[PDB]
Every structure is written in C-alpha cells, then in structure tokens.
Symmetry: C3
Subunit: 314 residues, 3 copies
C-alpha cells in the first residue's frame, strides 16, 4: 500500500503562532524514515505553500476566513489527487482547521467514508456560536450536511460541500465542549465517547462499539482526524488547548492499533502539534515523539512487536 | 434545587496548620460563582466561627478533644438546619474530622441516608487504636453504631449519636490503612473498594456495585464525604497525608458524575484541602481547581458538555 | 514461611555500569527490615561475590559470555540450596541476565514451576538474533527447551539445562520487542499480554487469565521475574532501557498482590534497578521505593491494609 505525507504548515485557524512548525518537527523526528521501515511504500509530497490573502477582514466574529478557506481549498485539491490514485493520505497539521480540506478532498474520491475524531474538543462551533472567531474550532461545522444553511456563507468557503452526515462521525476523548456545541451534538444525534464513557467502558469496549456503529452495515473507508490535544497534557503538552483528564499514551496507541487492524484506514490527520508551546525542550520532544508513535501505530507498528514475513530468524 | 455552602475552617483534627484556609481558597477560586452557573440555586452561608476551648488537655492520646467536639456540635446544628429546609448541604473543610458534625446533622433530618467515603484512609481509628491522637483519622469511629461503647467517652463528644451502621457506608480509594482500622472493617463487614478493587474492576464497575449495594433495596439520600487525598498526589498535592497510587483526576470526576446522575445527592464534604502545603503555587492551584471541578461535577457539570433546556442555539 | 534475600550485584549482561549497585540501594531503602515486619521469617544471605573471567573474548557478537555464564552458574547453585531447604528465594538484580541462574537453580528443586515475566522486553533473543551482544536480553533463550540447539553453544553456559517449556511462561507488560523475538514467541506459541492486551482487558482480567492458563490443570510453584522497566518510566526511571506506555504503579502492585494471594510464590527476581541512571536523586528514590513496595506486596502487604491475627485492637 502507498502512503503519501502532506505537510500543511498552517495557523490562522487560531491565535497562537507555532503550529505551522508542526510538520517540520514531525519530520525532524524521523517520521518519514521510520514509516519506510513498515510494510508500506512511502512518498513525501512535501509542504504545501499557502498564499496569504491580503486584507482578510474578519467575517462578523470569524477571523482570517479567506486565508483559511483558500489554504483549505488548496489542500482538498491535493488530497483528492493522491486519494484518486489509490494512496493513503497523511496530513501533518498546523491547526485542526485544515481538516476541512483534508476530509473534503478525501470524500470526493470516497463519498461513503466515515470519520473518527479523536479530540478533547468537538470543533463543531458554527460561525454564529463561536465565542472566539477561531476556525480551528469549527471544522466539523463546515462538513456536516445537517448544518447546511444553519449559518451565513463565509468568505472563501463557497467551494466547500458538506460531505458527511451526523451518522458518519464518532468522537472520542471529549472533555471541553461549549454549550452551543453540546446543543448541536445532542440535537443532531451524533455518536460520541467523552472521557466519561471511556472511563466507564474502558478503551477496549469503546473501540468495539465505534466500529459496530460505523462499520456494522457497510465496510467503508476510515478517516482518522487526530488532534494531539485528545491525549492528556502529560503526554502531549505542546499544543494550544490543553485539558486535563484525557486519553493516556496507552489509550491513544490502542485506538490507532485497532484502526490499523481494520485494514480500512484511508485518511489520517495528525493535528495541533505546536513546537513553540513546550515549556521545556523535553515537553516538545515528548509531544512530537508520541505524535510520531501514533502515526506509525496507524500503519502497523504493534506493541507486541513486528517481524518481517518469510524471514526465518532462526 | 437549593444548595447551601457552609465553610468549616477548622484544623485541630490534625497537627498541620493550613487546612482552615481551605474554604477561603475554594471561594477565591470562584467555587460559589461557578456553582451559580448550574441549574441549582446557591446560597453561601459563610464560614462558621469556632470558639476555642481553653485548657483543652488531651484525652489519653486524643488531642484537642473538646475544641473538636464543640466545633462539630456547632456544625451539626447548622447542617441539620439547612437540611430541614430541604436544601443540599455542601461543607468546605478544614480537616476531615468535621465529617462528624456534617454527617450527624444530616442524619438527624435523613436517618436513612448512606455514606460514600472517597478517601485513601478509612479514618476509623478509635481513641484506643490511634497511634497519633489526631481526630481527623477517627471520624467514622464516632459515627458507627457498631462501634458504640467500644471506646471510652471523649470530652466534648457526648452530644454525638451513632447515626449509621456498617451496612450504610462504602469506601472508595483506600490504600493506607492501619492494622487496627483494617481489623475493624474486616470484623464489621464494611464494604470497600481499595485501590486493588479499583484496579481490578475499573472505576465504572466499582460505581455500579456501590450503588446496587447501597441503593439496591431502598433509594435513600446520599452523603458524599470527599477527602481530596483520595486522588493521587499528582492531582491534589496540597494535602496533609498524600499517598501514591491513588485515584486519577478522571476517576474522581467519574465518581462525582455517577453520583450526580442518581439524583440522590443530599450532603457533600470537600475536605483536607491545605493551601499552605503546596511546594509551588501551581501545586496549590492544581489542588484547588480539581477540588472545585469535583464539586461542580457533583452538581451537573458533565465532560460531554452542558446546554440550557428550552434554548434553541440554532 | 522462610524468605532468603540473595544479592546479585552483576552487570555484564549489558553495557551500562550501575545495576550492580542495585542490591545496595534496595537494602539502603530498608527492604530487609520492612520485610521482617511481615508474617514471614527473613534471612539475608548477603551479596554474592562474582569472580571476573580474565580475557573474556566475545563469542561472535555475544559479550562477556564467560563472566556471565560463571556468575549465573554460581547463583543457580545458591538458589537451589535455599530452595532445597524449603525457603522462598528473592534475588536482587544487577541486570536481568541473572534470571538464568535464578530460574535454573529454582527449577532444580521444583521442575514443575511456572514463570511470570513482567517486562517491557521479552529478553528472548538468541545469540544469533541479538543486534547487540548484550545477554540481559537473552535470558529466556537459554532457558526454553524449545530453543535447545537452535543456537551455537556459548562459552560458560554448558552447565545450563533448559528447564521450562513455552507452555510454562507468561509475559506481561511487553511493548518493545525485536523482530526476531516477535518471530520466536509467535512461532513457539508463547502466552503473553503486551500493553495492548493490558489496555484492552484491564489488569484484573489479565491476571485472571494468566492464572487459569498456568495453574488451570495443576497448581505449581510460581517464579516471578520482575524487570523494573516493565512499569512506565514515570514510576521507575532509574533503569537502562525505559520504554514509554508501561504498567502503572497501581497495576504493578495489582500483579504482585494477586500473586501473593495464590500462596504459590516460590521464587522472585527484582531486576534492572540502576541507581546511577537517575537524572535527579528523586528519580532514583522513586525507583527504589516502588521496587521495594512491589517486593513487600509479593509477601502480603495489601493496600486495603494489614492487621496481626489474634490481636484485639479494641
Ligand atoms: N472551543 C474553543 C476551542 C476549540 C478547539 C479546537 B481544536 O481542537 O482544534 O484545538 C473554540 O470554539 O474556539
Ligand atoms: N491513619 C492516620 C492518618 C488518617 C488520615 C485522616 B485523613 O484522611 O482525614 O487525612 C491516623 O490514624 O492518624
Ligand atoms: N532488545 C534489546 C534490549 C533487551 C532488554 C533486556 B532487559 O529487559 O533486561 O533490560 C536487546 O535485545 O539487547
Ligand atoms: Mn482540540
Ligand atoms: Mn481539534
Ligand atoms: Mn480523610
Ligand atoms: Mn485521607
Ligand atoms: Mn529484562
Ligand atoms: Mn526490560
């Protein structure tokens, strides 16, 4: 199977500068080389160059709408391309707002795909409900069909086409949801596993249920959008929005290991890694490393170990 | 539902000065204001003023018996009063010896109540078994009917009437129990979930079991006495008796969330928060915040989120 | 029951100097005195003096083969001796290569014993598969009957007799296995619980299954070889090969508590504690203390508490 790394050094989805250095950090840690050591063919597409939209006036409360909408239109193009020729796309974030382009592009080639969203936040604020005009917290709002026309069109997002419905997404790791967002998920019947369900069920049963919910009827492509803040700040401290009480390093890998086993992984997002937010070099190293680990886990690396077929080690 | 905060800045239950600053810290952190944001009506009763018993000679090995017995008689009066008015009492500790008056007052109004004791210590030492004469580790001893007459009457506690039996209490979080105390709980058949049972069962099944054990037959009022040292020192380091290998921030919240769901919470105790024992300001802030979070969780705050009824956010 | 502590200050099993200071550190922390406080009779045999093999040329890639083989021949003699007298042997590591002599000695007296191996590593590399010639990662290879003749005889190990088969061993805590080793355990059908099974099942079910697998048919003596690196680096940082995503302090004690309850503990190994690898004195103290705790847990110490029989504390 082919793998194609796509860097998206973008950061207008939110106020904190740094996330755009995410892809560099993950590469510097040997992500690409370590991936080659797996049974997958790897091709690094490089980092996309995003053209800055001059005079990008805020839309009501939404900030940098055009720059974000354009950077995402570009990314969607690229992702659709690699997806078209049957390769698995792996996007390296900047901020999670790039998930708009990532998933959009993916859905063009695979319209029946489902989304597993490992986050601490639902990122489903609509331009009307956001308290801050930060777009990294509104990705899903622009993707859901059920949210079509429930908020004014935003400058630069006209190209977007709601590709997935409320029945095709499942949240895992939730613990910091705004009143508005909570209203939305309850109202639309979205499936989720907040930290309370994780604590209650254990990470084993949670994964078991997310699959029977999304793959029960039809087996379809899987798009994993992983926000590094879904793990507890103790594991991934170098991010913009820390939230105590999150998934452990162990649980994170267990999610990625189970997803690898389904053989349906089609698209991946490793978002919000911000190298400039580490209080100590070690905090940044901790974060990058676990991000990398999760990525390799998605593509086979098992904790029980791995050995190359047909090779008699004795 | 009405909520009434009652401050109990008391500390003769133990040697370390500081716990009496507990209530101030919790208020300074915005506990009261944050509670008003919930669906509950909140009334701050203020801090009780405890009259110091001059010439409080120790009783055999028990220290400050009269000052502790008096402060607890006063608190019980106050708690019975608010309970009578049908409000939920929330006591802010000082040290855990105030649970004597808190639960006593509560039981006067609701004699059929049950006690969930989240601690690391059983606090069931009798005046005869204590190694130190500290009363904060003997609360339960003065409350259990089964321990009546098993120890000499103490100066200042004559007013106390054993209100609950061994079948009405369940311990969660245990990991530091004295030989005497362990003898007592084994002998009296007290239900408990030490860290081993939590590890073995998972916090979800532990809660499930504690409810069917205490509410299986009759649904009754619940009294949650929460000793902040029940969580691991990494979450609540500002306390007098830290003990490694404790409940996690996540588990703690899961206990409070499940208790909120029962709709039976009638009395709450947030004890042993000692602002002066933090090695760094951050340790104190860590402790106060998680204490505050547990309190709001007991009253509705969910990690999946909250939204106000009848409000169409779209 | 009698308990006999045997120090094995050895370190050619691996490159990092320091592990030989392991026994001293554990004693300095009061291990022996704390053990005497249990219901067990304790006898300290002292530290074995290992004679250095001059001109110990490496065997192909294997380092210090003769010094390691001799030190292990000596240890086995001593362990067989105490085992013969019906006492429980507790070996204090140096490096884990000493498990060769520890288990061998034990098996001489109890040929039907089983081995529970708490590690992050399988330590089952054969002289041919090792990437590094370090022996501390090949102990099990010299003990398995199924691996007899699958690798050239090594200088100084001729005295070794493969004592246990693939059906008598169970691994718990695995998360860093080499391709070769993974091939071996898969090919030989060895039972194991890597971190993914621990995450999926919970430490409670894991223990339940390890017993029904090794004690289902016949109840036999148990040999617990505990590599302190099996726990997460956050609990035992002072070791040569830390690996993130490991057993928690709680889980570790849960394993030792359940093993105590079986009443079948016959042999124990507390290995890889390296006092010189602690970044801060606290890291070393953290490590030694938890190592000591696990040891006392193996011999009765429970988190729910302990009290001496026949003593009426009231
Ligand atoms: N809820 C906040 C934060 C949302 C978080 C977005 B993130 O997960 O991408 O970091 C907002 O609505 O702006
Ligand atoms: N076991 C000690 C300590 C008891 C702990 C009481 B505390 O939980 O309120 O802090 C004693 O008996 O004095
Ligand atoms: N897999 C490495 C490391 C093995 C680890 C051994 B230890 O657990 O005793 O530390 C090697 O084969 O040398
Ligand atoms: Mn997030
Ligand atoms: Mn996000
Ligand atoms: Mn207490
Ligand atoms: Mn306590
Ligand atoms: Mn080892
Ligand atoms: Mn190891």
């Amino acid at each position: 199977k082919p793998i194609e790394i796509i860097g998206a050094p973008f950061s207008k989805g939110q106020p904190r500068g740094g996330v755009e250095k995410g892809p560099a950090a993950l590469r510097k840690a040997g992500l690409v080389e370590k991936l080659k050591e797996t049974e997958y063919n790897v091709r690094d597409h490089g980092d996309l160059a995003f053209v800055d939209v001059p005079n990008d006036s805020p839309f009501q409360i939404v900030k940098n709408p055009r720059s974000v909408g354009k950077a995402n239109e570009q990314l969607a193009a690229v992702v659709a391309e690699t997806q078209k020729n049957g390769t698995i796309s792996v996007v390296l974030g900047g901020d999670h707002s790039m998930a708009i382009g990532s998933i959009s592009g993916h859905a063009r080639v695979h319209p029946d795909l489902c989304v597993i969203w490992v986050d601490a936040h639902t990122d489903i604020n609509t331009p009307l409900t956001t308290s801050s005009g930060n777009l990294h917290g509104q990705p899903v709002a622009f993707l859901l069909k059920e949210l079509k026309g429930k908020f004014p069109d935003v400058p630069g997002f006209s190209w977007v086409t709601p590709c997935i419905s409320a029945k095709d997404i499942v949240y895992i790791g939730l613990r910091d949801v705004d009143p508005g967002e909570h209203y939305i998920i309850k109202t639309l019947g979205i499936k989720y596993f907040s930290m309370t369900e994780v604590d209650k069920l254990g990470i084993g049963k949670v994964m078991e249920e997310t699959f029977s919910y999304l793959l029960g009827r039809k087996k379809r492509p899987i798009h994993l959008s992983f926000d590094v803040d879904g793990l507890d700040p103790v594991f991934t401290p170098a991010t913009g929005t820390p939230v105590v009480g999150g998934l452990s390093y162990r649980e994170g890998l267990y999610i990625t290991e189970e997803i690898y086993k389904t053989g349906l992984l089609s698209g991946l997002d490793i978002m919000e890694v911000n190298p400039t937010l580490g209080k100590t070099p070690e905090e940044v190293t901790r974060t990058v490393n676990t991000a990398v680990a999760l990525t390799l886990s998605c593509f086979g690396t098992k904790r029980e170990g791995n050995h190359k077929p047909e090779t008699d080690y004795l």
